[PDB]
Amino acid sequence: MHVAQPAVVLASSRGIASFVCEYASPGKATEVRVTVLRQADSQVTEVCAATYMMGNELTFLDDSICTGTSSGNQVNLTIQGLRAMDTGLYICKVELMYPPPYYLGIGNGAQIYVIDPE
């Protein structure tokens, strides 16, 4: 399954970074799980993840850094509290969980540029 996301995004003065991840739903979604991975030194790291039922607002946890909204084959990811030190490539993975068959999609990752204020 194909997943597309912006090639580059720079953070904000605060620490907020956003971007849209769009996947190619080959059928009746219903259950989709979205995961944001941070790649660096070729070492992946979960940034956050959430499952939403196609037809509901994508809602992350409280333990969570991210936040987002869904619109069709589109998701509105918003990471927060990013320090210039965690700047890097943020891959966006999408999974079609139910009903089966199961489909997996990995985007190329958006490059997020963050700078720690003076």
Partner 1 sequence: VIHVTKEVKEVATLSCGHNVSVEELAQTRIYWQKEKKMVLTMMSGDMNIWPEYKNRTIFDITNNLSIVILALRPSDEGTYECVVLKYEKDAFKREHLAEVTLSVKADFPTPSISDFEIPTSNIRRIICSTSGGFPEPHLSWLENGEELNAINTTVSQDPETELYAVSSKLDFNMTTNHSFMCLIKYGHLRVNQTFNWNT
Ligand X SMILES: CC(=O)N[C@@H]1[C@@H](O)[C@H](O)[C@@H](CO)O[C@H]1O
Q: What does the alpha-carbon distance between residue 109 and residue 98 come to, in Å, rounded to a whole number?
A: 24
Q: Which residues of 27-46 are buried (b: 16+ CB within 10 A; e: fewer)?
A: eebeebebbbbbeeeeeeee
96 vs 110, beta carbon nearer ligand X: 110
Residue 22 near partner 1 by CB under 8 A: no
Location of structure tokens 């993840």: 49
Residue 51: its H or E element: strand 46-53
Nearer to ligand X among residue 64 and residue 78 (C-beta) = 78
How far is Cα 89 from Cα 101, in angstroms, rounded to an integer? 29
Whether a cis peptide bond, with omega within 30° of 0, leads into 117 is no
Cβ closer to partner 1: 102 or 113?
102
Site for partner 1 contains 88 (CB under 8 A): no
Contact characters 71-110, ligand X, x per CB under 6 A: -----x-x-----------------------------x--
Place of tokens 């912006």: 6
Part in contact with partner 1 (CB under 8 A); list of ranges 11-19, 81-89, 97-105, 110-118: 97-105
The residues that touch ligand X, with contacts defined as CB under 6 A, are 18, 20, 76, 78, 108
The residues that touch partner 1, with contacts defined as CB under 8 A, are 26, 31, 33, 49-51, 61, 95, 97-98, 100-104
